[PDB]
Amino acid sequence: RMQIDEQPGNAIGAAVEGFDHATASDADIDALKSTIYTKKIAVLKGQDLSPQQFLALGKRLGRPEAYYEPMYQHPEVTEIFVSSNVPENGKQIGVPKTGKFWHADYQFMPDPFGITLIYPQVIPEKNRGTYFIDMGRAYDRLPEDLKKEISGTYCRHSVRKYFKIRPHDVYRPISEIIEEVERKTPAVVQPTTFTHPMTGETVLYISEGFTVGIEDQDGKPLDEELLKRLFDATGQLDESFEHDNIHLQSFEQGDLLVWDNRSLIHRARHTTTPEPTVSYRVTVHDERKLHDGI
Amino acid sequence: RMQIDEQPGNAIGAAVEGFDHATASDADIDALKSTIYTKKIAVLKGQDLSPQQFLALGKRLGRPEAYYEPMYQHPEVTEIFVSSNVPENGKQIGVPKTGKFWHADYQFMPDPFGITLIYPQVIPEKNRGTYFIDMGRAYDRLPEDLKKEISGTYCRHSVRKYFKIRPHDVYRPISEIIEEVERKTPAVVQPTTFTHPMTGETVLYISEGFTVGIEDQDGKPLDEELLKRLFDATGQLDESFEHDNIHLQSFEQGDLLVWDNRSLIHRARHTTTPEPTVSYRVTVHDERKLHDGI
Numbered sequence: 001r002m003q004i005d006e007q008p009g010n011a012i013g014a015a016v017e018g019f020d021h022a023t024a025s026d027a028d029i030d031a032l033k034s035t036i037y038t039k040k041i042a043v044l045k046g047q048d049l050s051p052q053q054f055l056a057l058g059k060r061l062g063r064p065e066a067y068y069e070p071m072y073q074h075p076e077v078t079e080i081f082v083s084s085n086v087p088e089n090g091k092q093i094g095v096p097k098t099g100k101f102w103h104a105d106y107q108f109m110p111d112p113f114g115i116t117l118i119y120p121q122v123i124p125e126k127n128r129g130t131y132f133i134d135m136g137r138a139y140d141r142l143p144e145d146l147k148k149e150i151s152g153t154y155c156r157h158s159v160r161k162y163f164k165i166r167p168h169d170v171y172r173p174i175s176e177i178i179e180e181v182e183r184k185t186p187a188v189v190q191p192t193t194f195t196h197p198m199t200g201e202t203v204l205y206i207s208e209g210f211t212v213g214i215e216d217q218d219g220k221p222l223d224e225e226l227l228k229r230l231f232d233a234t235g236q237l238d239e240s241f242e243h244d245n246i247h248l249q250s251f252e253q254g255d256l257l258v259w260d261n262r263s264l265i266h267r268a269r270h271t272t273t274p275e276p277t278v279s280y281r282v283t284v285h286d287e288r289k290l291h292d293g294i
Numbered sequence: 295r296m297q298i299d300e301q302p303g304n305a306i307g308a309a310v311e312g313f314d315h316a317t318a319s320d321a322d323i324d325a326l327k328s329t330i331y332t333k334k335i336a337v338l339k340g341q342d343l344s345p346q347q348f349l350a351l352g353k354r355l356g357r358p359e360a361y362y363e364p365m366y367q368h369p370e371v372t373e374i375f376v377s378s379n380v381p382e383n384g385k386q387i388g389v390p391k392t393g394k395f396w397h398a399d400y401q402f403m404p405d406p407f408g409i410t411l412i413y414p415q416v417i418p419e420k421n422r423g424t425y426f427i428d429m430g431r432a433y434d435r436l437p438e439d440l441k442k443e444i445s446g447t448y449c450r451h452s453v454r455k456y457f458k459i460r461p462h463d464v465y466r467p468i469s470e471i472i473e474e475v476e477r478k479t480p481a482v483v484q485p486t487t488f489t490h491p492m493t494g495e496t497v498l499y500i501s502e503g504f505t506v507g508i509e510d511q512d513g514k515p516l517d518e519e520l521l522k523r524l525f526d527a528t529g530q531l532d533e534s535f536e537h538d539n540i541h542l543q544s545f546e547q548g549d550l551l552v553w554d555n556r557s558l559i560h561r562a563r564h565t566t567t568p569e570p571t572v573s574y575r576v577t578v579h580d581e582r583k584l585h586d587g588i
């Protein structure tokens with residue numbers, strides 16, 4: 001019964017009714033994926049799933065990868081990444097209020113996955129949602145001088161700013177954790193732009209949260225002001241979130257968000273209050289790498 | 295009944311018998327302090343003290359200052375800093391295995407105290423002790439080219455390497471803690487050498503743990519190799535601890551160590567094993583600042 005209702009023209013997003021991951025056909029999945037690659041966000045409606053069913057759904061779209069730090073993992077389905085501030089039997093499950101910064105998922109890793117799935121569990125009614133920027137479209141809207149300046153350049157991405165302290169880190173000297181992070185997840189180099197392997201779009205692959213430097217073709221660093229100007233032009237420095245590149249995606253119970261993790265950067269919008277909020281995440285590799293240079 | 299038995303000649307240290315902090319006279323305290331300033335380490339023998347009595351003893355020597363991070367504090371006497379890996383009723387008291395790096399206490403703070411007191415509580419029999427270097431004597435033993443090179447220079451000291459993660463830091467992004475530490479305890483500048491206000495000695499006031507840069511009189515940084523050469527010449531890079539500047543101080547139950555926190559740097563020697571070890575610390579300001587430029 002799957003019906004895809006794409007937003008008109010250039011507007012981002014699509015709504016998907018009648019989707020049952022257990023009965024959807026191969027053609028259903030291919031159509032769904034194609035909507036993800038061209039409309040960037042697919043909101044599956046009326047999803048009422050167990051953790052095992054959410055994983056099964058992600059497995060229809062590609063190969064799931066479990067987040068590399070175990071404290072994020074759901075206790076029954078290790079492939080599920082949990083953002084939660086609601087204890088269960090008094091125990092912290094997952095990590096509170098993940099993602100409160102512009103990023104693409106796994107951008108700081110050598111081999112980022114193409115598709116992110118979010119299944120919200122507990123949703124505040126007030127100021128909850130996810131901000132998105134389409135960095136393909138943000139590239140196209142760059143001034144021509146900036147496009148020329150970044151041609152041929154490379155960016156370095158690192159988790160070093162937003163790596164979250166883990167329970168066993170208590171009482172350790174902070175430099176030991178800083179060095180461990182650099183050792184286990186060293187900064188990764190990507191071309192500043194790449195060609196989206198599904199659509200052919202040019203994507204400006206940077207985020208304020210993870211992108212820490214930009215450099216010329218030899219790997220010689222450039223003034224970080226160049227990075228700051230790219231963040232500013234693309235809307236990532238606008239603390240009011242009114243910039244034209246920014247799309248605010250809300251969601252209601254039963255929604256399941258699936259989105260293009262090559263093209264989009266995003267940032268969790270949370271309440272300014274201690275209100276319960278829980279989301280489950282599955283992240284999958286599709287039929288191609290992030291770009292064909294991987 | 296206090297009797298001070300100073301080690302002969304130039305050898306470091308003294309033993310103190312018959313000391314009762316509650317009955318010792320003003321002349322006893324003045325003699326004890328003078329031994330601390332000239333012999334650098336005073337081991338008080340046969341001390342059998344409650345936490346309140348240990349604080350009272352420190353108060354005979356000067357004005358106690360409580361460590362600025364509360365997780366180190368003894369639960370009854372906030373002025374007592376606790377190094378402990380032995381839980382009490384299951385609860386972590388103090389901080390495990392503090393000081394496993396060369397430093398002077400509070401060297402990273404604007405106004406370091408002159409006297410450190412250690413009252414060991416649980417002592418492993420095997421490889422336990424405290425390494426010390428007399429940085430006055432280490433200065434005098436520097437080659438003449440090095441003495442000239444550091445003349446007029448300044449060093450910056452920071453807790454940024456060995457600040458210990460606190461329980462409430464769990465799940466925070468690490469950059470937020472890094473920035474908090476820089477904000478609350480910014481790096482402090484001291485002259486590279488100063489005149490010991492009690493003895494007139496020239497002290498080379500650096501430690502591998504806290505000293506992060508050296509700079510000329512204008513505050514222009516110098517090559518950090520200059521700092522590395524000072525650490526190397528003074529014995530702080532010798533991982534075998536056999537260098538001639540190094541003194542290993544052991545202790546037995548009832549010992550109470552009191553030492554010159556202007557002249558000495560030190561480093562905890564712990565077992566290579568998970569063996570119980572507990573020490574209490576009181577730190578006091580005496581009649582003068584660290585040096586007369588404070």
Ligand SMILES: C[C@H](CC(=O)O)NCC(=O)O
Pocket residue numbers: 095097098099100104105106107108159162163164
């Ligand atoms: C550091 C972030 C997780 C978080 O915000 O806690 N990494 C998420 C990801 O890249 O998939």
Ligand SMILES: C[C@H](CC(=O)O)NCC(=O)O
Pocket residue numbers: 389391392393394398399400401402453456457458
């Ligand atoms: C960071 C150190 C404490 C420790 O080793 O945990 N400061 C001790 C002091 O300066 O008095």
Ligand SMILES: [Fe+2]
Pocket residue numbers: 099103104105266
């Ligand atoms: Fe994310």
Ligand SMILES: [Fe+2]
Pocket residue numbers: 393397398399560
């Ligand atoms: Fe110390």
